[PDB]
Amino acid sequence: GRLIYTAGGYFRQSLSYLEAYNPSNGSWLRLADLQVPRSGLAGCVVGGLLYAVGGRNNSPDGNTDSSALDCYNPMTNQWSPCASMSVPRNRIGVGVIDGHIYAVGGSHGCIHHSSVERYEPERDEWHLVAPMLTRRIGVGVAVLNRLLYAVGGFDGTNRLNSAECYYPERNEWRMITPMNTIRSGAGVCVLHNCIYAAGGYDGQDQLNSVERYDVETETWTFVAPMRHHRSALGITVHQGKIYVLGGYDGHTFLDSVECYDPDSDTWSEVTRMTSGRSGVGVAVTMEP
Ligand SMILES: CCCC[C@@H]1CCCN1C(=O)[C@H]1CCC[C@@H](c2cccc(-n3ncc(C(=O)O)c3C3CC3)c2)C1
Ligand SMILES: [Cl-]
């Protein structure tokens, strides 16, 4: 069985929680805390291991952007530090290609990064790759067909509808068709042949809308909206369904977990996180 792991997030201050949801029975397990509280991080999985990447500790007595990469082994229920990134990256996005982790964009104080770097677990090493064409924080990242997509975010001045694609073998970024909606701090994932962008902030309002990019048609199409408007949601895929976790609706830090069924084009509530939070990291791996 596989679990949806949520790491970190924010309510009143950045959080250390690691919790695992089992779709097969509705259950939540609390697991070993992160060593350092963090919101605005990303999660990903490589070789069964769960990684927490970047973020920021928003704490009553200091705010510290994170360059940290930390590894959770479900077999041991322990977090281990890995090599740190070149730079702190709060409000980060990440994607895995061929066993390597791409850390994309994010902020360090008022610095809005266009830089991108790549972690190799076998060497425990980060290396910079070509920067994005746009500075992006609160950037959604997805991998489809071994290409890396950076979608929306905030460039230091404007929230963005733009998106771009990284071609590893050319070490080159190129624009793709922009979304139909400006989205910063959305949830971005892949399902079948499409990149989904769910929720986000458009400059004025938290969004419930959801659109998807078909790489063959190069167009974005709206699908059914989520039940909740959400910015800084977590998102993942578990057995062919999109799950969105938490976020902020303009009023409440949501505990709502919703899932999307592409065949009926419907969103439904599936569970509730143990407490409302935004800016979590999310990924899927084996039970611990
Ligand atoms: C410490 C900040 C105060 C608490 C804020 C305001 C009330 C709701 N609240 C949050 O929920 C934040 C909690 C920490 C993580 C943060 C977070 C995560 C990931 C992406 C982004 N991000 N990046 C760009 C933009 C943008 O505005 O364009 C955003 C904002 C829209 C989410 C922000 C959210
Ligand atoms: Cl923040």
From Swiss-Prot:
Outcome of swapping residue 58 to A: Impaired interaction with SQSTM1/p62
Species per Swiss-Prot/TrEMBL record: Mus musculus
Assembly mode: Component of the BCR(KEAP1) E3 ubiquitin ligase complex, at least composed of 2 molecules of CUL3, 2 molecules of KEAP1, and RBX1. Interacts with NFE2L2/NRF2; the interaction is direct. Forms a ternary complex with NFE2L2/NRF2 and PGAM5. Interacts with (phosphorylated) SQSTM1/p62; the interaction is direct and inactivates the BCR(KEAP1) complex by sequestering it in inclusion bodies, promoting its degradation. Interacts with NFE2L1. Interacts with BPTF and PTMA. Interacts with MAP1LC3B. Interacts indirectly with ENC1. Interacts with SESN1 and SESN2. Interacts with HSP90AA1 and HSP90AB1.
Full-protein interval shown: 325 to 612 of 624
Disruption phenotype: Early postnatal lethality caused by abnormal cornification. Mice survive until weaning and probably die from malnutrition resulting from hyperkeratosis in the esophagus and forestomach that cause gastric obstruction. Defects are caused by constitutive activation Nfe2l2/Nrf2, leading to constitutive expression of phase 2 detoxifying enzymes. Mice lacking both Nfe2l2/Nrf2 and Keap1 reverse the hyperkeratosis phenotype and are healthy and viable in normal conditions.
Recorded superkingdom: Eukaryota
Description of post-translational modifications: Non-enzymatic covalent modifications of reactive cysteines by electrophile metabolites inactivate the BCR(KEAP1) complex. Accumulation of fumarate promotes the formation of cysteine S-succination (S-(2-succinyl)cysteine), leading to inactivate the BCR(KEAP1) complex and promote NFE2L2/NRF2 nuclear accumulation and activation. Nitric oxide-dependent 8-Nitro-cGMP formation promotes cysteine guanylation (S-cGMP-cysteine), leading to NFE2L2/NRF2 nuclear accumulation and activation.
Residue windows of the Kelch repeats: 3-48, 49-99, 100-146, 147-193, 195-240, 241-287
Subcellular location: Cytoplasm; Nucleus
Site positions per UniProt: Sensor for electrophilic agents: 110
Positions where S-cGMP-cysteine occurs in the chain: 110
Phenotype upon changing residue 231 to A: Impaired interaction with SQSTM1/p62
Stated family: Belongs to the KEAP1 family.
Effect of residue 56 to A: Impaired interaction with SQSTM1/p62. Abolished interaction with SQSTM1/p62
UniProt comment concerning the protein's domains: The Kelch repeats mediate interaction with NFE2L2/NRF2, BPTF and PGAM5. KEAP1 contains reactive cysteine residues that act as sensors for endogenously produced and exogenously encountered small molecules, which react with sulfhydryl groups and modify the cysteine sensors, leading to impair ability of the BCR(KEAP1) complex to ubiquitinate target proteins.
Name of the molecule in the record: Kelch-like ECH-associated protein 1
